[PDB]
Design a binder for this molecule. Structure first.
Ligand SMILES: [Mg+2]
Ligand SMILES: [Zn+2]
Length: 314
């Protein structure tokens, strides 16, 4: 399949088999030339892709297909916006970070770990509990001898690659969303990003911004994809509500809704207060991405129509 046919904005891993998903991940490494750049052993790349997939759990949303969605979307974002400042090391780092960013997720939020006083919350002092666990596991898999995709990087390259993987995964925590939004507003106020290839700190910030954008792939896909994934996330929220009840823990109110009306109500709130203001800042810094505002508006209108037919049939 041609690259411009596989690498489009309508891709959804939901409709693919495990065999095809492994193939899609390989193609992403092929097209970005990171294999020949760092002499990646394809036996270790295939073993790493296998251990990452099996290290994901079978949740409705936070599963291996979500990780492939994030990688594929990250491929599109970097290809469209970052090809003229991202380094070869950072490009490989973003591939490992996208695929590993939700390793061992169990469908439970950080708040669950903090409220339940879980082992993970104790180890990580309630700070970005899930994301710290994902990143830690990412290197435990990556640094097994038979999976060392980055075995040929020298000392300084691996230090940069590791710092990029850590920072990007940690910044998928929604608790740092508004931190990155405020920095993004300040960047757009003085004209946008300049000399990104000279500024390793701000370029790393851009990468974190892009991985976070790719993580929120539901409102920027066709509405059929948006609906299926959002409903799978809603199932995780309702599942956590049930578990929190059995444990006699407090539950957040928006996780209790379990029908189509409350699903549309919630996604309209998520788009209007998280995704759309985010992509309005992203589009200013990167005008090549403002076509996603049209996808977000299209899905928003489609969600508003559903919530309208429920207002009517009172
Ligand atoms: Mg996550
Ligand atoms: Zn994620």
């Amino acid at each position: 399949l041609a690259a411009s046919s596989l690498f489009t904005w309508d891709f959804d891993a939901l409709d693919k088999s495990d065999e095809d998903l492994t193939a899609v991940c390989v193609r992403v490494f092929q097209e970005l030339h990171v294999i020949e750049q760092f002499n990646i052993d394809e036996k270790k790349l295939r073993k790493w892709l296998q251990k990452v997939r099996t290290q994901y759990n079978k949740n409705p949303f936070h599963n291996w297909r979500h990780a492939v969605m994030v990688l594929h979307t990250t491929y599109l974002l970097l290809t469209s916006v970052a090809t003229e400042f991202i380094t070869e090391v950072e490009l490989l780092a973003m591939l490992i970070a996208a695929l590993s960013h939700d390793l061992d997720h169990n469908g439970l939020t950080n708040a669950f770990h903090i409220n339940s006083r879980s082992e993970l919350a104790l180890v990580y002092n309630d700070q970005s509990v899930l994301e710290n666990h994902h990143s830690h596991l990412a290197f435990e898999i990556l640094l097994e001898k038979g999976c060392n995709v980055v075995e040929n990087l020298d000392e300084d390259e691996f230090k940069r690659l590791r710092a990029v993987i850590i920072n990007c995964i940690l910044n998928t925590d929604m608790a740092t969303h508004h931190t990155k939004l405020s920095k993004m507003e300040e960047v757009n106020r003085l004209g946008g990003f300049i000399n990104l290839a000279e500024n390793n700190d701000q370029r790393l910030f851009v990468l974190a911004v892009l991985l976070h954008t790719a993580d929120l792939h539901n409102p920027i896909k066709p509405f059929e994809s948006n609906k299926r994934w959002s409903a799978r996330l809603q199932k995780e929220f309702n599942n956590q509500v049930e578990l929190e009840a059995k444990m006699n823990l407090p539950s957040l109110p928006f996780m209790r809704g379990n029908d189509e009306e409350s699903l549309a109500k919630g996604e309209i709130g998520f788009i209007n207060f998280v995704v759309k203001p985010w992509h309005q800042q992203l589009s200013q810094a990167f005008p090549k991405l403002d076509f996603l505002l049209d996808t977000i508006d299209a899905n928003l209108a489609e969600w508003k129509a559903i919530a309208e037919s429920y207002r009517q049939m009172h």
